[PDB]
Amino acid sequence: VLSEGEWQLVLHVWAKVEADVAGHGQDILIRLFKSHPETLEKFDRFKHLKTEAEMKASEDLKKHGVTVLTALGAILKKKGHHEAELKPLAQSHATKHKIPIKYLEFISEAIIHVLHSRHPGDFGADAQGAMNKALELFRKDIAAKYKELGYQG
Numbered sequence: 245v246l247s248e249g250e251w252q253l254v255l256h257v258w259a260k261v262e263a264d265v266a267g268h269g270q271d272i273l274i275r276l277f278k279s280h281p282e283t284l285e286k287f288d289r290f291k292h293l294k295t296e297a298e299m300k301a302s303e304d305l306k307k308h309g310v311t312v313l314t315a316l317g318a319i320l321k322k323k324g325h326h327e328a329e330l331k332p333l334a335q336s337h338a339t340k341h342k343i344p345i346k347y348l349e350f351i352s353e354a355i356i357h358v359l360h361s362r363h364p365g366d367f368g369a370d371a372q373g374a375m376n377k378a379l380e381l382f383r384k385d386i387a388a389k390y391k392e393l394g395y396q397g
């Protein structure tokens with residue numbers, strides 16, 4: 245599970261991430277499209293922004309950019325006693341958005357790499373995994389719920 249040693253560590257860099265929600269976020273976005281162009285069309289808000297440049301260019305997309313952080317800003321803080329947060333994601337994302345855990349794993353991986361560029365030395369040989377176990381718990385507690393959801397797969 246998550247050791248008392250990295251729960252400040254995975255929440256440390258999210259403290260040091262508390263700095264910019266959008267900038268790291270306007271990034272956690274792109275590696276989800278630029279490694280995965282599909283999650284784009286999957287995000288019908290914007291399917292209409294093809295080119296890479298206009299990305300930091302758009303102001304609204306940035307509107308959504310904090311949201312996820314604010315989710316992680318609610319999620320990560322719980323530290324696994326998060327349960328309060330998980331239903332609303334489990335639902336809007338399964339039923340209304342139709343985005344599976346692998347996209348929400350694509351995003352974890354977007355986030356994960358997106359923290360690498362902004363945070364170099366800040367990123368530990370200990371932080372890498374704290375991100376996963378911290379993500380894998382978020383990813384683990386929704387995919388199990390698509391079972392109470394019937395939308396998993």
Ligand code: HEM
Pocket residue numbers: 283286287288289311312313315316333336337341343347348349350351352
């Ligand atoms: C860090 C991972 C994720 C978190 C915390 C997150 C969080 C959120 C939140 C808080 C909202 C707005 C609430 C609403 O109106 O229902 C939202 C909306 C949305 N999300 Fe995510 N999301 C995540 C991953 C993804 C992924 C991987 C996709 C794949 C397409 C996605 C697609 C969407 C779409 C299409 C919307 C709808 C926007 C709207 O019209 O309001 N999300 N997400």
